[PDB]
C-alpha cells in the first residue's frame, strides 16, 4: 500500500492513483515574487469559538485530531471562499530533521512541519460528497519553525504516547484550535489537491504567510510516532510529506503586498 518509504513513496503513487500526474496537484513552491496581489480577496473569517474536538487517531501516515462536524460549530468563511466550510480534522506533516518537513515551500525554503486544518463545503452535505467537487474542500496551511514552544500545542504533544501505533485512538475533547493560529491571517491561495491518496483536485488551498514557532522538544515527540501497527517492526513516522508538484496553468494569489 502507499506510504513514504523507498518502495511505496510519493514517486510511486501514480501507479495506483494516476491523478498524481494531474493538472492541479499539491503541494507547490510559492514563488513570492510571481504571486499576484489581488485586492479583491477578502479577509479570512475563522470562527472556532464553538469547536468540539472528539478524538485523536494514528491512521498510519499521520495523526488526526477530529472534530464534530454535524453542525456549523467551527467554520471558515471569507477569503477566496464562497459559502461556509466546516472543520472536520487537522493533522501535520513533519521531517526527520528540522530542515525539512513542510509540504509547501516558500521561495524553495522548507519548514520543519506543516499544519493542515481541513474544512468541507456545507453545500455538499457531507465530507465524502465534498471531495468529488472542485470547490469541495478548504485547507488552511500553517508552517512550523523550530524556536520557542507553542503552549497551545502541548496538549496534543502529551497525548501522542497513547496513539504511538497505527489504528490507535484516544478521546480528545475540549481542545481549542485557536491556540494554533499565528498573529496575522495574511495568506496565499491557489487551487490544488489533497496531498495524500486519493489526491483529488477538490481543494482551495489557503496558506498563511506567518509561521508559528514550536520548540525542538515538541517536534521531537512527533518523530517518536510509528507508521506500523502494534506488534509489527517499528518504522518511525517521519518525513510524511509530499514533494512540491509542478504549478502548471495555475496562479498563486496573495492577500497582501
Ligand atoms: Zn496534510
Curated annotation (Swiss-Prot):
Superkingdom assignment: Eukaryota
pH dependence: Optimum pH is 6-8.
Reported effect, residue 194 to F: Normal activity
Mutagenesis or variant effect for residue 62 to F: Reduced activity
Effect of residue 196 to H: Higher affinity for bicarbonate. Enhanced proton transfer capacity
Effect in UniProt of substituting residue 118 to A/G/I/L/S: Reduced CO(2) hydrase and p-nitrophenyl acetate esterase activities
Name of the coding gene: CA2
Subunit field text: Interacts with SLC4A4. Interaction with SLC4A7 regulates SLC4A7 transporter activity. Interacts with SLC26A6 isoform 4 (via C-terminus cytoplasmic domain).
Signal sequence residues: none
EC number: 4.2.1.1, 4.2.1.69
Biological process annotations from GO: angiotensin-activated signaling pathway; carbon dioxide transport; morphogenesis of an epithelium; neuron cellular homeostasis; positive regulation of cellular pH reduction; positive regulation of dipeptide transmembrane transport; positive regulation of synaptic transmission, GABAergic; regulation of chloride transport
Free-text activity regulation comment from the record: Activated by X-ray, histamine, L-adrenaline, L- and D-phenylalanine, L- and D-histidine, L-His-OMe and beta-Ala-His (carnosine).
Catalysed transformations (reactions): hydrogencarbonate + H(+) = CO2 + H2O; urea = cyanamide + H2O
Modified residues (Phosphoserine): 162, 169
Stated consequence of mutating residue 141 to R: In OPTB3; complete loss of activity
Main location: cytoplasm
Official protein name in the record: Carbonic anhydrase 2
Details of cofactor binding: Zinc. Can also use cobalt(II) with lower efficiency, but not copper(II), nickel(II) and manganese(II).
Effect of residue 61 to W: Impaired activity, rescued by 4-methylimidazole (4-MI). Impaired activity, not rescued by 4-methylimidazole (4-MI)
Outcome following mutation: residue 64 to Q: 2-fold decrease in enzyme efficiency, as determined by kcat/KM ratio, and efficiently inhibited by chlorzolamide
Phenotypic consequence of residue 139 to H: Impaired activity
The entry's keywords: Acetylation, Cell membrane, Cytoplasm, Disease variant, Lyase, Membrane, Metal-binding, Osteopetrosis, Phosphoprotein, Zinc
Amino acid at each position: 500500500h502507499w506510504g513514504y518509504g523507498k518502495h511505496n513513496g510519493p514517486e510511486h503513487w501514480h501507479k495506483d492513483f494516476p491523478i498524481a500526474k494531474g493538472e492541479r496537484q499539491s503541494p507547490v513552491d510559492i514563488d513570492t515574487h510571481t504571486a499576484k496581489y489581488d485586492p479583491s480577496l477578502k479577509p479570512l473569517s475563522v470562527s472556532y469559538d464553538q469547536a468540539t474536538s472528539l478524538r485523536i487517531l494514528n491512521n498510519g501516515h499521520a495523526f488526526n485530531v477530529e472534530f464534530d462536524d454535524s453542525q456549523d460549530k467551527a467554520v471558515l468563511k471569507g477569503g477566496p471562499l464562497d459559502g461556509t466550510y466546516r472543520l472536520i480534522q487537522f493533522h501535520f506533516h513533519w521531517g526527520s530533521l528540522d530542515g525539512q518537513g513542510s509540504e509547501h515551500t516558500v521561495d524553495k525554503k522548507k519548514y520543519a512541519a506543516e499544519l493542515h486544518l481541513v474544512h468541507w463545503n456545507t453545500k455538499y452535505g457531507d465530507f465524502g460528497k465534498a471531495v468529488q467537487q472542485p470547490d469541495g474542500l478548504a485547507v488552511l496551511g500553517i508552517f512550523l519553525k523550530v524556536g520557542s514552544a507553542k503552549p497551545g500545542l502541548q496538549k496534543v504533544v502529551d497525548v501522542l504516547d497513547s496513539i504511538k501505533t497505527k489504528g490507535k485512538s484516544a478521546d480528545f475533547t475540549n481542545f481549542d484550535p485557536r491556540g494554533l493560529l499565528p498573529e496575522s491571517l495574511d495568506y496565499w491561495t491557489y487551487p490544488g489537491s489533497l496531498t495524500t491518496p486519493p489526491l483529488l483536485e477538490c481543494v482551495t488551498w489557503i496558506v498563511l504567510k506567518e509561521p508559528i514557532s514550536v520548540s525542538s522538544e515538541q517536534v521531537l515527540k512527533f518523530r517518536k510516532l510509528n507508521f506500523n501497527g502494534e506488534g509489527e517492526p517499528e518504522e518511525l513516522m517521519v518525513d510524511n510529506w509530499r514533494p512540491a508538484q509542478p504549478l502548471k496553468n495555475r496562479q498563486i494569489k496573495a492577500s497582501f503586498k
